[PDB]
Amino acid sequence: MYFIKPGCLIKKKFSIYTSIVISVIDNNSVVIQSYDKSDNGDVISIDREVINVSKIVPIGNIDIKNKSKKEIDGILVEENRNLKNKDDVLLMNDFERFKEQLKKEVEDMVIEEMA
Amino acid sequence: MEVIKKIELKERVCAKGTLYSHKRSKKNIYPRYSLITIENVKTREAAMKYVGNAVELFKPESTKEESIHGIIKAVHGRSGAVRAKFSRNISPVEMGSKVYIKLYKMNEDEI
Amino acid sequence: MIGKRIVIDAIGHVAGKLAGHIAKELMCGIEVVIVHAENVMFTGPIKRGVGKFNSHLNKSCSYNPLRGPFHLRSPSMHLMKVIKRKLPHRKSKGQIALKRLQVFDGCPTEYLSVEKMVCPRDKLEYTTSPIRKSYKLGDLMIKFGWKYESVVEKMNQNEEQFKIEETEKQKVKEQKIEELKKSNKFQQRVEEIMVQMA
Amino acid sequence: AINEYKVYGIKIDDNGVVGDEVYAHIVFATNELLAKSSFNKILKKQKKIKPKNTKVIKVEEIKEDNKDLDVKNYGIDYYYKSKRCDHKGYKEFRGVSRCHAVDKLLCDIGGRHSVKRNLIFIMKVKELTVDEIKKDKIKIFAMEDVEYPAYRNVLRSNKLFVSENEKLFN
Amino acid sequence: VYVYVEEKVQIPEGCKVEVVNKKVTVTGPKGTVSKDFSHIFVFIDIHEENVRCRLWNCRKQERSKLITCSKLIKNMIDGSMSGYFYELKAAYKHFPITFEIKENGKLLIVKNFLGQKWAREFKMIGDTIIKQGVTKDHLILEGISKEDVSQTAGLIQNNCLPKNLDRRIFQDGVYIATKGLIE
Amino acid sequence: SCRNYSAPRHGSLAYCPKKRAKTTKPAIKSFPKDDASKPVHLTGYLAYKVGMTHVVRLSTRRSKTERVLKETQKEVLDAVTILEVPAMRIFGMVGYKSTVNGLKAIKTVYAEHLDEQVLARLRKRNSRSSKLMFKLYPQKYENGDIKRDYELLKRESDVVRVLAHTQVSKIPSLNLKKAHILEIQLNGGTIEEKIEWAIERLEKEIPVSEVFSQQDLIDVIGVTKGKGKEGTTKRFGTTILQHK
RNA sequence: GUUCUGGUAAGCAGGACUGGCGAAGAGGAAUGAACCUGGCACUGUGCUAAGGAACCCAAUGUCUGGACAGAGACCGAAAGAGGUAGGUGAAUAAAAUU
Ligand SMILES: [K+]
Ligand SMILES: [K+]
Ligand SMILES: [K+]
Ligand SMILES: [K+]
Ligand SMILES: [K+]
Ligand SMILES: [K+]
Ligand SMILES: [K+]
Ligand SMILES: [Mg+2]
Ligand SMILES: [Mg+2]
């Protein structure tokens, strides 16, 4: 089991990207640095916020024994670099989606004959 | 058999929804308007993008007219339901039925 | 929508909360099958449940008991009557809706294979605090004369057999196909069929 | 939410500025009208100037900085009206602002003593260091010695029905 | 509200303990015992040769349950290294009570209590066995489980008293004399 | 106001509503608990009521605490009923399965040769029949259908019962040409043993001496004498009112 | 509704002041002459009140404290102990305790 202590990595309710806890206030509230992205044009923003614990899920730990705000922004942009909003099939144009569909569909016709 | 074909044609091109009530208070009903829920639409902001779109109720067992047309007029509540108007008033016997959402806008006069 | 069916595994849900969600679907035209009715959970000590049920048996029609209330003594039928009174059953629309519902203790053989749904908001471990007691409907109903407990234990053992067999049968095909598809003999024909579709 | 304001005002009669004194009052309230109301209340009870002989010259909001949301310890002196009489007391809280501290007291007394927010009066708000702390409650959190795990489960999806074989919580 | 509560019990040299879920099982020289703590809200684990209970942010009446949990675990450990005993003693002013041990020490019969002609039969709970003491008036019970041992002894004491007579004149009975661990 | 004096109720409510029985022949509806520890045995039979007489028996029953020295023996006069019990013949078997709705029948299997007396129950009016009743069933012996049937009964059953009829032609005073048919349960052993025991005995006659012996305790099920429509004084025992 | 006189009181008898029902429909308090919102010719589109928002039944969720009694959401006195959450004032202290 993980613990809620400075340097815990968390996700928020119905969200894909990671955020990090910075201070603990009481037995139910914390201060977090939060990452999010505008799907309108890849515009990111990272900012600090006070939150109740019933909206967050812990997943791991990092050191951050002493760091500045600009440093932790760096930690965060590295951490969630790989992640994405949506599966690309819904983002691409129609012909490209059909081309991707054919691959899967033909592969089944092979497998059902080969098995 | 034309009915079996007309269904498959509609199934491939429309979103799906169900009729569940007339517009009503605790005491009175307003049968000129009907309430619909659409399959994967679950917030009021999501639902706003359908206001203006055409809807059709298809009923093959009918002897008079095989389909009724209508239009989505407004959003209703906070969980993504909508309000619609049809060329004829919907009977209480037709509640629970499947409705088709047609992916193009029409004017209030066309119905 | 009329023409849609749904199968629900009742284990670990709080009775009065699931019943509200189910009743709404019946009014929208869905056919519902509930399985494992003997495992639904009520909150509080069993002691309180026993007193609420004793007060119910005391109720009867003064002049003719064959008109008066019928006190049902099976977990399936009890949960059925909880759902019944969350519908408009004195009118035709409620009587139509009720006939779309079936409830079973255990899992019958015709429903072993079918894939099954669940309701996260109504599960005990979400909707209640850990520090307080609860009981199962199967535990209350043995005290008021249910007579088919053992029949349900025998059913429950057939389910366990089917689960282990199906999972074992699946894991072999998963291994087989995933080991197969890495081969050249497979990856060759991809090209051979595509030559005729490109 | 609660805000902090400072109100200034003078006496007038049939003619202007009848006294050369100006009076001031710091208050925690939700808006300016609830602030002005408090100013009238205190003037009439500690002096005897009724509204028709008063004029407010200024109202200002007071705001802190705290760009990094740093956490601080505060002590608060308060009283409230019950059915019996008026009850005085002192309690300690943690937060990112004086207003954050004050909103937590108001919530506490409503929870513990069944009092509406308008029957509670703040006398003093003071920011404190670790050696100053009197009562037991906040000291462990102040000395930076706390970790705990999660007791509440969290939903994965907004859908009402999900397949048995999916992951349900967190 | 308590911020943190922890309790610890040390596992002796010969003993072995496992925890499956909230069932805790113990093995050692005298045999095996197990008990299920699923009815208590607590977190149990094994760590550095100790058994550890923990809770965070709990109420006053939740921490009482944690402590009670920890004392029961110790009794299981102790009982596995040596069993417990209970000693019973017959007392009479006129009619001598007599005892029979049957079924290898799983059944006790009592005869002639206050001159009554009907017999009484008592069954041993769980692992427990019944044995003869230093003089004819004494019985000894021995077993692994402090619960099973003490419950048995109690049932005998509670039944073998006068009824509808003045107990400060009629003082006859079977009484619990001594209790402890075996050497 | 409360009634002036106390008195008990008239008649028992355990038997209300007191309606007329549907037919004159009873089914045994409840059977004693099975025990796998004993041999296969039958649990019931059919009988006809003849009439009554009386007997004298010797007795020596007295209180265990009675201090009398002598082994006193005493005559007692007692009334008795006589029942006639000709041998029943076995003609088929039924298997049942346990469900959430109780016992349900799986299949029934009949003997190859059946008697005129038993076929006569299947038709309504005795003297007007083409008698084409069971004439096609014997083929099922040749086809192996019987051997498939026994397999299914043996594979999936919880309770096994035999079918037996009575030989009415032996009791001429009944004026009856149709046999009576009863379903009787087998207790003891396992399902396989029960089925083999039954198979050995189709078409044969079982005497009453198989089922009961002297000094045994038994339960008797029957329909009482009929008395027509009657008033409250006789039906429930209420008192007659004032003479004027 | 606010007040008064006679009476142990009363859905009792009798006065004063400002609006009602009588002669007043509609939506809301599950139901109710008089209570809450608010005064009516006949149609159509929008918005709010009072009161609601798991299900019956159109619209529901979130945060922080309390509370375990077949309790409460609907509900009786003088007198009281027990459990638990907080305030204030006295001590003692080789963790604290009264
Ligand atoms: K009377
Ligand atoms: K019966
Ligand atoms: K009039
Ligand atoms: K009027
Ligand atoms: K009404
Ligand atoms: K009235
Ligand atoms: K609704
Ligand atoms: Mg007569
Ligand atoms: Mg009115």
CA A35 to C1' G32 (Å) is 60
Cα separation, E26 vs E40, whole angstroms: 19
Count of CB atoms within 10 A of residue F20's CB? Answer: 6
Which of F57, F67, F1, F35 minimizes the C-alpha distance to F194?
F35
Cα separation, E93 vs E111, whole angstroms: 15
**Sign of the four-CA dihedral C163, C164, C167, C170:** negative
- Per-residue burial over E19-28, b if 16 or more Cβ lie within 10 Å, else e, is eeebebebeb
- How far is Cα of residue E48 from the mean position of the Cα atoms in its chain? 29
* Closest-CA residue of chain D to E4: D148
List CB contacts (< 8 A) between E1 and chain A: 27
* Closest-CA residue of chain C to F158: C151
From the CA of F227, which ligand is nearest?
A: 8
Q: Token match 């029934």: residue?
A: F108
3-state SS record for D65-102: CCCCCCCEEEEEEEEEECCCCEEEEEEEEEECCHHHHH
Please tell me what DSSP assigns to residue F19. Answer: P
Is the minimum distance from the CB of C27 to strand G below 7 Å? yes
Å resolution of this model?
2.8
DSSP string over F121-173 = HHSSSTTS----SSTTTTHHHHTTHHHHHHHHHHHS-SEEEEEEEE-GGG-GG
The Å distance, Cα F6 to ligand 1 centre, comes to 12
Cα separation, E1 vs E59, whole angstroms: 5
> How far apart, in Å, are the Cα atoms of F177 and each of F23, F90, F113, F189?
18, 18, 18, 37
C101: three-class secondary structure by DSSP: strand
CA E174 to C1' G88 (Å) is 56
Which of F52, F53, F70 minimizes the C-alpha distance to F62?
F70
Backbone angles phi, psi at B34, to 5 degrees: -125, 155
Q: Which helix (H) or strand (E) holds C107?
A: none
Q: Tell me if D7 sits within 8 A of D39, measured CB to CB.
A: yes
Cα separation, E167 vs E104, whole angstroms: 34
Cα separation, E89 vs E140, whole angstroms: 9
Count of CB atoms within 10 A of residue B77's CB? Answer: 11
Please tell me what DSSP assigns to residue D155. Answer: B
Which of E166, E164, E182, E183 minimizes the C-alpha distance to E85?
E182
Cα separation, F237 vs D32, whole angstroms: 91
Q: Which helix (H) or strand (E) holds B92?
A: none
Count of CB atoms within 10 A of residue E33's CB? Answer: 23
Beta strands in chain D (DSSP E): 3-11, 23-29, 54-61, 72-81, 86-95, 120-128, 162-163
Cα separation, C84 vs C31, whole angstroms: 15
Which amino acid appears at position F12 of this protein? S
> How far apart, in Å, are the Cα atoms of E58 and each of A57, A73, D109, D151, E62?
21, 36, 21, 11, 6
Helix axes F145-155, F191-199, angle to 10 degrees: 150
Is the minimum distance from the CB of B73 to strand G below 7 Å? yes
Is the minimum distance from the CB of C84 to strand G below 7 Å? no
Q: Tell me if C76 sits within 8 A of C104, measured CB to CB.
A: yes
Backbone angles phi, psi at E63, to 5 degrees: -70, -25
Asked if E64 is an interface residue toward chain C (Cβ–Cβ < 8 A), one would say no
Cα separation, D35 vs D29, whole angstroms: 6
List CB contacts (< 8 A) between E3 and chain A: 27
List CB contacts (< 8 A) between A25 and chain D: 71, 94-95, 141
DSSP string over B64-81 = S-SEEEEEEEEEETTTTE
Count of CB atoms within 10 A of residue D149's CB? Answer: 14
Q: Token match 């046999």: residue?
A: F179
Q: Tell me if E91 sits within 8 A of E172, measured CB to CB.
A: yes
Backbone angles phi, psi at E18, to 5 degrees: -140, 155
List CB contacts (< 8 A) between E41 and chain D: none
Cα separation, D161 vs C32, whole angstroms: 13
Residue D116, class by beta-carbon neighbours within 10 Å (0-12 exposed, 13-18 middle, 19+ buried)? exposed
C37: three-class secondary structure by DSSP: helix
Bridge partner list, D121: D79
What lies within 8 Å, CB to CB, of B71 at 6+ separation is B52, B53, B54, B55, B84, B85, B106, B108, B110, B111
Cα separation, E114 vs E100, whole angstroms: 17
Q: Which helix (H) or strand (E) holds C126?
A: helix C124-127
Cα separation, C22 vs C100, whole angstroms: 11
Q: Tell me if C138 sits within 8 A of C150, measured CB to CB.
A: no
Cα separation, A34 vs A53, whole angstroms: 14
Strands E50-58 and E43-47: antiparallel
A99: three-class secondary structure by DSSP: helix
Which of E20, E28, E61, E26 minimizes the C-alpha distance to E44?
E20
In the structure encoding, which two tokens stand for residue F234, read together?
Answer: 């006789």
From the CA of F5, which ligand is nearest?
A: 1
Of A102, A109, A114, the CB nearest to C186: A114
Count of CB atoms within 10 A of residue E133's CB? Answer: 13
3-state SS record for chain E: CEEEEEEEEECCCCCEEEECCCEEEEEECCEEEEEECCCCCCEEEEECCEEEEEEEEECHHHHHHHHHHHHHHHHHHHHHHCCEEEEEEEECCCCCCEEEEECCCCEEEEECHHHCCCCEEEECCCCCEEEECCCCCEEEEEECCHHHHHHHHHHHHHHCCCCCCCCCCCCCEEEEEEEEECC
Is the minimum distance from the CB of E74 to strand G below 7 Å? no
Q: Token match 């007489």: residue?
A: F53
Q: Which of C63, C104, C148, C149 to mutate to test binding with chain F, by most F CBs within 10 Å of its CB?
A: C148
Q: Which of E1, E56, E62 to mutate to test binding with chain D, by most D CBs within 10 Å of its CB?
A: E56
List subunits contacting chain C, requiring 3 or more Cβ pairs under 8 Å: A, B, D, E, F
Q: Name the strands in the sheet holding D86-95, side by side, starting at the edge strand that comes first in the sequence.
A: D86-95, D72-81, D120-128
In the structure encoding, which two tokens stand for residue A10, read together?
Answer: 């968390």
